[PDB]
Write a structure and sequence with these properties.
The structure is a monomer. The chain is an alpha+beta fold. It has a single domain, classed as Aminopeptidase (3-Layer(aba) Sandwich). It has five helices and nine strands; from the N terminus they run ββααβββαβαβββα. A five-stranded antiparallel β-sheet has the order 1-2-3-4-5, with helices on both faces. Strands 6, 7, 8 and 9 form a four-stranded antiparallel β-sheet that branches. It binds coenzyme A and zinc ion (ZN). The site of coenzyme A (COA) has 19 residues, from strand 5, helix 3 and helix 4. Zinc ion binds next to loops. GO terms for molecular function: acyltransferase activity, transferring groups other than amino-acyl groups. It holds the Pfam family Acetyltransf_3. Keywords: Acyltransferase, Transferase. It comes from Pseudomonas aeruginosa (strain ATCC 15692 / DSM 22644 / CIP 104116 / JCM 14847 / LMG 12228 / 1C / PRS 101 / PAO1).
Length: 185
Amino acid sequence: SAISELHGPRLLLRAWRDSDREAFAEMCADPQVMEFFPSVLDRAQSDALVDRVQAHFAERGYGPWALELPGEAAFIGFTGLFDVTMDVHFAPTVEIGWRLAPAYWGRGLAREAAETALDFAFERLRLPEVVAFTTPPNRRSWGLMERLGMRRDPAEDFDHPLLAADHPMRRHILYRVDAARWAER
Ligand SMILES: CC(C)(COP(=O)(O)OP(=O)(O)OC[C@H]1O[C@@H](n2cnc3c(N)ncnc32)[C@H](O)[C@@H]1OP(=O)(O)O)[C@@H](O)C(=O)NCCC(=O)NCCS
Ligand SMILES: [Zn+2]
């Protein structure tokens, strides 16, 4: 396979390692990290998530990269691209998502990771568009989407189809950025 690593000024976006699973599990168990998600995850659930990531990298050659901070930390979380195949109005497409350990918030690291992942999406993969979705309360998350230059149509708000019809977290907002908008920043 030989999954290609992506480099920013500060960040290394790399394939996941066994050593990552411990660090990622405490992130998944952190109520500040998982605040706008349905719940925190146990070790088994966190490992399942990593298995899905590795399987995504095996099939597609890209995925949510593990974020390394050379000269500081081996693992501060993930940022990158996931294929959207679920039954939503904007499928099929590619989504960008991110999760940082709280110690690394407020540093522009999610921004830098996301810019590196989108550079890849538009320059190497040459995708027409990348989406991002989150819940309205998760201001840190859609705050990053709009600072990245992604734009929301409130009319494109949707109920996540892999949650229950009456799930309290069901309502998601959609941000989009196309090759043209990304190149124009
Ligand atoms: C969503 C999340 C990744 C955002 O991370 P973040 O660190 O807030 O985002 P950025 O990398 O853009 O950093 C922005 C902050 O750094 C500051 N900053 C400092 N130096 C900066 C730099 N060089 N570049 C950019 N921002 C910089 C900005 O002013 C801003 O400060 P503020 O948040 O207090 O206003 C993070 O809150 C998180 O992991 N949350 C939990 C997981 C989650 O919900 N993910 C979304 C799933 S839908
Ligand atoms: Zn959600």
